[PDB]
Amino acid sequence: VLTALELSNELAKLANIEKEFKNDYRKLSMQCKDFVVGVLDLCRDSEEVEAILNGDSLSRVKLAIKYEVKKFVAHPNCQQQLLTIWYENLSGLREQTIAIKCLVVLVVALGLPFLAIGYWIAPCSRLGKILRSPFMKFVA
């Protein structure tokens, strides 16, 4: 999968450089992207999904984002992992509606200085884990 991703990068770069056989190189890059997506598709367990998403830190997801492999990153097998990591240490908020999320944003906005002041004890506090989540960073 890493070989296919680097080959997709190389084929896209050569498509840009050549400008004569750009269609052929773009088709080859699409073939590499399709192979990567097909390899990701056959996952049936979280362990296999993690193994494809990073080798022996979403290394492969980051490397595919760098190479504009849209279908590998937008695949549900990767979105299920990205959502679990995104809603880390707060899982009940994922199923809430958009209105509840906006209410959470407003609550954070009203009490942002208070939680910032309390962040000193946050590493030893239970709420520090929530405030350090990848979602509460975006809301903050």
Partner: protein
């Protein structure tokens, strides 16, 4: 490989449908174990199932000690081998056990290689029952036969269910849980299972 001459002759005769050769092999032969499998090959019964041979499969089913029956049942269900499915379901293993109704993942301690594929995994997902696979392939005859034996697609719980079983599955390997739910719904939403499942479909 580690295979010998006699068992290789058995395997090729079964794969190519040499009924008299197989019959001679299984009569008065101490060697040539019935469930001998290559390192990266299929069982003899799996080979007989893959290429339609009712007589060879039934003659293999004569032997009491023989594994990979569930995998061959799944393989036959994946195709139109209705007669082979009927022959396999006639084995006493399915009749006197909960293997048919329950999924391979949670049927038992899975000590035996009943649903096992070549080396480690399974031909399909571990949470796909034979009836779910039959619904997936929309095999009306196979679905009807499996339903007549008491095997039905158990309805998955609500997405927000908090029971011990659902929480245990969600705690570890949640992607497999979601995929199993999707597979169960795909089996339920199949026209074959919808039409042959219950009254007023």
């Amino acid at each position: 490989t580690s295979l010998t001459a006699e068992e290789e002759r058995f395997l090729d005769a079964a794969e190519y449908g040499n009924i008299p050769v197989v019959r001679k092999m299984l009569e008065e032969s101490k060697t040539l174990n019935v469930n001998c499998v290559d390192y990266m090959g299929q069982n003899a019964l799996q080979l007989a199932v893959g290429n339609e041979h009712l007589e060879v499969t039934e003659l293999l089913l004569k032997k009491e000690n023989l594994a990979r029956i569930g995998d061959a049942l799944l393989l036959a269900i994946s195709k139109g081998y209705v007669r082979i499915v009927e022959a396999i379901l006639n084995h006493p293993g399915f009749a006197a056990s909960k293997r048919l109704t329950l999924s391979p993942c949670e049927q038992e301690l899975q000590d035996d290689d009943f649903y096992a594929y070549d080396e480690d995994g399974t031909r399909f997902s571990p949470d796909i029952t034979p009836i779910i696979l039959a619904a997936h392939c929309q095999k009306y005859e196979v679905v009807h036969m499996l339903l007549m034996k008491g095997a039905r697609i158990e309805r998955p719980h609500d997405y927000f269910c908090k029971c011990g079983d659902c929480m245990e599955k969600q705690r570890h390997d949640s992607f497999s849980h979601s995929r199993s739910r999707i597979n169960a719904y795909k089996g339920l939403a199949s026209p074959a299972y919808l039409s042959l499942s219950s009254e007023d479909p």
